[PDB]
Design a protein around this ligand. Sequence first.
Ligand SMILES: O=C1C[C@@H](c2ccc(O)cc2)Oc2cc(O)cc(O)c21
Ligand SMILES: [Cl-]
Length: 215
Amino acid sequence: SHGMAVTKVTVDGIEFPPTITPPGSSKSLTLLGAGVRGMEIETIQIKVTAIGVYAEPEVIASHLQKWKGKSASELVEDDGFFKDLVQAPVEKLVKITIIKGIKGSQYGGALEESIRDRLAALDKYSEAEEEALEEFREFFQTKSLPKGSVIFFHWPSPSTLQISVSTDGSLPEEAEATVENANVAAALLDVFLGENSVSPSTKASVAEGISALLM
Ligand SMILES: O=C1C[C@@H](c2ccc(O)cc2)Oc2cc(O)cc(O)c21
Ligand SMILES: [Cl-]
């Protein structure tokens, strides 16, 4: 439209939709915040993906009431806030837009090993998690992730992880994989929102969104 107000959200120029329906779901989630995942390799700051976090705004707000009135800065500096967010028993979705093309096995292998190690550090790695991580890794082995492809990670509840990939950025229609393991599902969300997050900018953006939502 050239005549009515339009809203656009961008992460370094990359558009994110302000709302999304998870693959295979029927309900609509709103963008809480989004950021870039950068990697410093041999002193070069490479942008590799953009990450958007979605949930039902009023619903997630109702599960974060103690944080009401906190500014974005106060939330971003508080590990307890992000732990509440990761644990909140509400539907969540993370949309990843691939910036640097990569093989699925490389993306999935790196993430799987990080989850393995992070779970081990917390003493939350047992045979159940090992098995779930094999399922996770094997899903990504079947995919290619060229520039512009999208990954949808969907948590219909905190113990269930659904995954879908689109190589053209399109939104899939049912989940391609379902991994039933509470610890792996939570650990993946924590890769984005927890300590030693891969994207401080995503965390900061989500803190801004939630701070505003709560007020
Ligand atoms: O460089 C990597 C490897 C990978 C990764 C590296 C370290 C780590 O701890 C976890 C994952 O993430 C990526 C994602 C991309 O779209 C493109 C990339 O080139 C990369
Ligand atoms: Cl990522």
